[PDB]
Symmetry: C3
Subunit: 340 residues, 3 copies
C-alpha cells in the first residue's frame, strides 16, 4: 500500500497479518509441517524515486514477525529480515541491485511456488542460489534491452558469506537465468555455481569444492488458468539433516520436480493442487534417499485484495522408515489473512 | 493514525515514544517495579477491509520495541510481538479472529486496568485467559445479534502451547464472557478453563491438571468519571516464584481484588487512585501468601490526543518478610509520552 | 516521509535500505572495517504535534534492522533500537526530551561526522556522552531565550545503567555544551562527567572513579563548502580491547583529532576527504598507543533527495606492530543507498 507520493518519490508500506494454524497428528515432527500455532505478521516498504525519464531508483526492506511466541525469553524466535536491498534501473539498459535478495535460480523456482500455504519446498532460505540470500549483486534486463518483447534475463554475483553454520554459509559464486513469455506461455532456465566454505566441507554430509543449482520452468498463466512445472538439479547444495545420527550437511546430488495446477474462479475461490518430489543421491552412508514427496490439495477463498482465507492439505508420501527420518505424516493448514 | 483509506481498505499505523523512568528506594531489588530507565516504543498496524455492506475483514499487528537496552547483546532484551491476528465480522452475527490476542477474562480484567503506568496486576502475559495469549480463536457478538443494545458476549477457544518454559506454556482450553452496559453503568463476567502441560505439573509450586480463571467486574464510565471494581479467582493458574528457594511455578488458588477511582478534568489533568490485592492460598511449603497488595496514587496530564505526561506512585504495602520474597519497597513512575 | 498531518498532529515515517560492502585483503580480519556484506536497513518515526501556538510535543523512535544476517540463529545479530525519546518544545524557552538520544558531546563531534560511511570515530555507541546513549534527560536552548540569535546551548543528564557488559555500562552523570554560528562559521564546545560502574573498574584496563569526555569543534558551512575540525580528550571513558591478551576496558586518557573537507557539486557529486587520529595514553602495560589513524579519500554521488551511491577508501596509517593489536590494513566502502 502506497502511503507517500510527492516530489516524485513513492513508498509502499505493505504488510500482512496472517492467522495460521497447522494440523498434524500427535505432537508434530514425524509430520510434514508440524502441529500447532503458526501465526505471523509482516511489515515492509517498497520505495521508489524517479531520477529522470529513463532512470529510476529503488529500495525495499521487509521483516518477518512471528505471532506464535510468548513475551518471555523466546520472544524473538523466528524473526528475520527477509529483504533489505537497493538498486537502479536505467531505461532499457536494465536493473542492478545490492543487499539481501532472492537468489537468481529462484526466477525458475518461482513458477511452481504458488500454493495456498506450503510448496516451494526447494526454495531454501540462505541456500546459495535457490532462495533469499544476503550480499547478492544482480543485473536484470527485460525484453532483451527492449528489443524483443517477452525475452527477459538476469545475471547474479554472490558474495562470500562465512557464517557460523555450514547450513547458512556460502563462498563466492555466480549464476544467471533467462525467461521467455508469449501470449500466456512461459519458459525459464537458471543456473548458479559457488565456492564452498571450509566449514561447509568439514560437515559430515557432502563432497565438493563447488555448489551447483539449476532449474527450469514452464508455465501457462492466462484465462484464469495457472499451470506450472519445474525441474531442477543440485550438486552439493541441498541442505539435509540425519535425524538418527543428529548429523547435518548437504546432499551430494538432488533431483527436484514440481507440478502445480490451479484455477481462479471469478467468485473468489482458487482451488489448488500440486505434486513435489525432491530426492537426494549419493548421501554418504545412505546413498539414495527421498527428501520431499507429496501430493497437495488446497484452496484459497478471496474476500478481496485485502482479505482471504485458505486451507491446504499436504499428503506426504515419505516412508516412516525414511533413511533420514524425514516426517511421513500429512499436514493441513488453516489460514486467515488480512493484508495491505 | 489513519494514513490509508482507499478501495475499501483502511490502515491505521499507530504507535508511541514513551520516555519512562521508575524511581524506587535503595536499588529496588526489593521494590514493586524496580529502578532506572524503562523507556519504550510501540508499533503496530490496524488494517480493516469492507468486503461488502455487512462484511468486514480485519488484521492487526503490534510490537513492543525497548528503549532501555544498549546497542550490544541486550539489544533485544524486552522486545516482543504483542498482538498479531486476523478475522472477520459479519453483519450482526458477530466477529471472529485468530492469532495472538487478549484473553477472554481480560474482558473483565480490563475494567480496572486504567492506571497511568502500573495496574491490571492479574493480566499476565501467556497466563492462559487473563492476558495476551498465543493461538486463541475468539468469537464475540455485540448487542446479542443486534437484538439487545448493550448485550455483548464471547466464546474463546485456546489451542495448546507446549513451550520451553513452564511459565509461558498452556494446554487446550475454552472460555467465555458476557457483558452488559447501561447508561454509564457496566457489568462483566468471564471464565476460562484449560489443561496444564506436564512440564507445568512437574513444576515445584502448584498441583492440578486443569487451570481455571474467572473474574467479574463493575464500572461507571460517564461525565469525566471512571470507577471500576474487579473480583476474580484462579485455580492452579497464577504464575509465582519462590525467591528464597529460587523455584518457580503456579499458585494453587488466588483471589484478586481491584478498586480504581479516576476523574478527567477538562483542562488536561486526570487524577487517579487505585487499590490492588491479589493473594494466594495452598502454596506448597508456605501456604497462604500475598502476591500483590498496594495503594496507588497518581495523575495523568493530557496536552492533547498526541502528547501527555504522567506520574504513578505505588505505595507498597507488601511486608519485608514476605514468604515468597516479594518486593516491599515503594516505586514511582515518571512518564512523558508522544503517540500518534 | 510525512504521511500524516491532521488534527494538530504530523508523522514522518522515514528510513533507508543501504546496500553496503566492505573491501579488505584476504580474510579482512586485520583491516579497519573488515571484509564483506554489511547491508542494513533503518526504519523510524519522527512525530510532532502542535499543542498550541508556542508548545509542540514530539516523539521519535529509530530502529536498526541488519541485512547481513541469516534467517537462522544469527537473524538478530546486530539489530537494535537507535532512538526512543519523547519531549516538548516551548517557544524560545527551549526543548526537553527523555529516553535514548544522541549524547551531548556529540554536539561537537557531529561537526566531523560527515563522511560517506566512516568517520566520527570518537562517537562510540553507548559510550557515555560521545554517542547514542540510554537514559538521558536533555535540555536544549536555541538563540538563548530568543535574546541572542545563533547562540545555542545544552545540558544533559545521564541516568545510571548497570549493564551486563562494562562496555555498554554507565553510572550517574551530567554534561553540557555551547555552540555559536555566524554566516557559515561555527564553533562548539562540549564536556561531560559521570560515575563509573563497579563492572567498569573491575576491568583490566582503566583507573578512575570518574569518566570524562570533552571536545571542541570548528566548521565553515556555506556556498557548497564544508570544512570541520574536532579535538577532544577523554579521561577513563573511551573503550578499548587488547587483541593479544584478549582483555577489554577503557583507556585512561585519549587525545582525538578529526579534519573533514568536503565540497558539494551541483551535478550531484560530493567529494570528501578526512583525517582521523585518536591515540591513547596511560594504557596499562602498553603506555602510549594509537587506536585510530587514517587519511580518508572518497566521494558520494547524490541522484536526488532520495537516492545516493558512494565509494569510501580508508588509508590506514596504523602500523602492523600496533601494541593493542589494532588492524593496520586499509578498508573500502561500496554503498548504494535508497532512503525516504
Amino acid at each position: 500500500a502506497e502511503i507517500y507520493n510527492k516530489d516524485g518519490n513513492k513508498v509502499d508500506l505493505y504488510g500482512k497479518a496472517v492467522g495460521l494454524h497447522y494440523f498434524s497428528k500427535g505432537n508434530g515432527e514425524n509430520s510434514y509441517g508440524g502441529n500447532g500455532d503458526m501465526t505471523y505478521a509482516r511489515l515492509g516498504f517498497k520505495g521508489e524515486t524517479q531520477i529522470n525519464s529513463d532512470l529510476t531508483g529503488y529500495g525495499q526492506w521487509e521483516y518477518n514477525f512471528q505471532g506464535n511466541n510468548s513475551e518471555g525469553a523466546d520472544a524473538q524466535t523466528g524473526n528475520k529480515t527477509r529483504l533489505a536491498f537497493a538498486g537502479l534501473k536505467y531505461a532499457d539498459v536494465g536493473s542492478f541491485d545490492y543487499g539481501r535478495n532472492y537468489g537468481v535460480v529462484y526466477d525458475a523456482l518461482g513458477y511452481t511456488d504458488m500454493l495456498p500455504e506450503f510448496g516451494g519446498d526447494t526454495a531454501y532460505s540462505d541456500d546459495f542460489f535457490v532462495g533469499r540470500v544476503g550480499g547478492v549483486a544482480t543485473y536484470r534486463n527485460s525484453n532483451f534491452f527492449g528489443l524483443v518483447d517477452g525475452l527477459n534475463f538476469a545475471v547474479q554475483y554472490l558474495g562470500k558469506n562465512e557464517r557460523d553454520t555450514a547450513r547458512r554459509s556460502n563462498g563466492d559464486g555466480v549464476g544467471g537465468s533467462i525467461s521467455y513469455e508469449y501470449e500466456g506461455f512461459g519458459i525459464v532456465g537458471a543456473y548458479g555455481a559457488a565456492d564452498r566454505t571450509n566449514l561447509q566441507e568439514a560437515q559430515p554430509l557432502g563432497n565438493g569444492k563447488k555448489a551447483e543449482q539449476w532449474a527450469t520452468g514452464l508455465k501457462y498463466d492466462a484465462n484464469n488458468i495457472y499451470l506450472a512445472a519445474n525441474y531442477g538439479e543440485t550438486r552439493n547444495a541441498t541442505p539435509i539433516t540425519n535425524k538418527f545420527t543428529n548429523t547435518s550437511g548437504f546432499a551430494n546430488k538432488t533431483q527436484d520436480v514440481l507440478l502445480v495446477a490451479q484455477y481462479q474462479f471469478d467468485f473468489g475461490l482458487r482451488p489448488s493442487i500440486a505434486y513435489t518430489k525432491s530426492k537426494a543421491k549419493d548421501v554418504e552412508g545412505i546413498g539414495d534417499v527421498d527428501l520431499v514427496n507429496y501430493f497437495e490439495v488446497g484452496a484459497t477463498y478471496y474476500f478481496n485484495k485485502n482479505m482471504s482465507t485458505y486451507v491446504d492439505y499436504i499428503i506426504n508420501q515419505i516412508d516412516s522408515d525414511n533413511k533420514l527420518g524425514v516426517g511421513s505424516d500429512d499436514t493441513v493448514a488453516v489460514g486467515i489473512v488480512y493484508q495491505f
